[PDB]
Design an enzyme around this catalytic site. Sequence first.
Site, mmCIF file in Angstrom:
data_model
loop_
_atom_site.group_PDB
_atom_site.id
_atom_site.type_symbol
_atom_site.label_atom_id
_atom_site.label_comp_id
_atom_site.label_asym_id
_atom_site.label_seq_id
_atom_site.Cartn_x
_atom_site.Cartn_y
_atom_site.Cartn_z
ATOM 1 C CD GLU A 1 -0.886 -9.077 1.068
ATOM 2 O OE1 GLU A 1 -0.959 -7.832 1.228
ATOM 3 O OE2 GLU A 1 -1.726 -9.733 0.409
ATOM 4 C CG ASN A 2 2.074 -9.018 5.573
ATOM 5 O OD1 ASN A 2 2.619 -8.381 4.672
ATOM 6 N ND2 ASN A 2 1.010 -8.559 6.240
ATOM 7 C CG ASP B 1 -1.761 -7.186 8.093
ATOM 8 O OD1 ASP B 1 -2.732 -7.794 7.592
ATOM 9 O OD2 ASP B 1 -1.142 -6.291 7.466
ATOM 10 C CE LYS C 1 6.994 -1.610 4.457
ATOM 11 N NZ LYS C 1 6.242 -2.564 5.368
ATOM 12 N N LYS D 1 0.809 -1.222 0.000
ATOM 13 C CA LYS D 1 0.000 0.000 0.000
ATOM 14 C C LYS D 1 0.845 1.275 0.000
HETATM 15 N N1 LIG Z 1 12.653 -8.658 3.195
HETATM 16 C C1 LIG Z 1 12.032 -8.968 2.025
HETATM 17 N N2 LIG Z 1 12.565 -9.852 1.142
HETATM 18 C C2 LIG Z 1 11.929 -10.164 -0.016
HETATM 19 N N3 LIG Z 1 10.732 -9.656 -0.384
HETATM 20 C C3 LIG Z 1 10.088 -8.763 0.413
HETATM 21 C C4 LIG Z 1 10.729 -8.363 1.682
HETATM 22 N N4 LIG Z 1 9.894 -7.492 2.287
HETATM 23 C C5 LIG Z 1 8.838 -7.311 1.465
HETATM 24 N N5 LIG Z 1 8.943 -8.071 0.348
HETATM 25 C C6 LIG Z 1 7.948 -8.100 -0.749
HETATM 26 O O1 LIG Z 1 7.304 -6.813 -0.817
HETATM 27 C C7 LIG Z 1 5.941 -6.893 -0.383
HETATM 28 C C8 LIG Z 1 5.495 -5.751 0.532
HETATM 29 O O2 LIG Z 1 6.276 -5.654 1.737
HETATM 30 P P1 LIG Z 1 5.552 -5.220 3.118
HETATM 31 O O3 LIG Z 1 6.664 -4.987 4.096
HETATM 32 O O4 LIG Z 1 4.600 -6.321 3.451
HETATM 33 O O5 LIG Z 1 4.795 -3.892 2.653
HETATM 34 P P2 LIG Z 1 3.364 -3.267 3.147
HETATM 35 O O6 LIG Z 1 3.621 -2.787 4.554
HETATM 36 O O7 LIG Z 1 3.095 -2.107 2.232
HETATM 37 O O8 LIG Z 1 2.379 -4.408 3.015
HETATM 38 C C9 LIG Z 1 5.816 -8.238 0.311
HETATM 39 O O9 LIG Z 1 4.478 -8.726 0.234
HETATM 40 C C10 LIG Z 1 6.839 -9.091 -0.430
HETATM 41 O O10 LIG Z 1 6.321 -9.513 -1.698
HETATM 42 MG MG LIG Z 2 2.588 -2.158 6.350
HETATM 43 MG MG LIG Z 3 2.472 -6.395 3.849
#
Ligand SMILES: Nc1ncnc2c1ncn2[C@@H]1O[C@H](COP(=O)(O)OP(=O)(O)O)[C@@H](O)[C@H]1O
Ligand SMILES: [Mg+2]
Ligand SMILES: [Mg+2]
Length: 265
Positions: A134-135, A130, A36, A17
Amino acid sequence: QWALEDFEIGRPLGKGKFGNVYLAREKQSKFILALKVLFKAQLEKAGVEHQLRREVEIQSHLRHPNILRLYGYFHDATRVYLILEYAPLGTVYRELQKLSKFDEQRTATYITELANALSYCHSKRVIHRDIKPENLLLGSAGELKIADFGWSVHAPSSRRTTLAGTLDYLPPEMIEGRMHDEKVDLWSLGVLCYEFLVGKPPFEANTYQETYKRISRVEFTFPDFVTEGARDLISRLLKHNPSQRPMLREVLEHPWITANSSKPS
Ligand SMILES: Nc1ncnc2c1ncn2[C@@H]1O[C@H](COP(=O)(O)OP(=O)(O)O)[C@@H](O)[C@H]1O
Ligand SMILES: [Mg+2]
Ligand SMILES: [Mg+2]
Ligand SMILES: O=C(CCOc1ccc(F)cc1)N1CCSCC1
């Protein structure tokens, strides 16, 4: 300390998001990691500064093999940058879309690793809130790692922020805006166990409004191929009344888990 100048950026790992996550290498150590990126303008519009602060605080202090590390952060007047441990085998979400369903051994092993990481979190009265595919990320040996602590808090609590996307993993107390505690993560663990075995979450529907109805009434059924042991565990976790949900030790000790999981407590 750190700034953008210190890193070479590579390929996009994923989108969220607010977050766009990139592969990166630190110039003098050659250390590979994930970066990130969050836009200050969007963070402000949505007013979720406090969530970001919680994410950095809670996650940098935790240390567990089944939880993703956060090493640090910096910012540059348009963006905030979180420095994360890189997970080379991707998301559980991607793996589920690839295979459609997991077998009983895969499912039980993922559930043990989750229950271990959550046990560690709850011992500090931290709740994630959460947990969804996907997390959940995968390390170099295929081990599961919990990520994205943006919604995490200390118990007890109410919800002070608007639910943005999917209702699919949230318990009744949480969607009805009531007070909640640790037991919210046990409900989500049950939702996940079902989605791993079946290929879709148990309260899925076409509209927000009907998903909301199915969750508050706990209306779910099993396909024929789900075995009796799996049904027993899932039925215990998906209880309307939080207090009737089992402790994490009971999940780790359940017969179906012990019979099928290939990792210990
Ligand atoms: N440490 C990581 N290594 C590999 N892929 C990652 C990592 N962190 C995030 N991702 C990818 O990026 C996406 C979004 O990261 P996330 O931290 O969950 O963002 P948000 O807080 O916006 O949901 C994850 O669903 C995954 O596909
Ligand atoms: Mg988040
Ligand atoms: Mg996420
Ligand atoms: O400009 C700032 C403060 C400096 O950046 C931080 C980032 C994370 C943090 F935990 C603490 C500070 N912010 C951008 C808007 S959201 C709050 C953070």
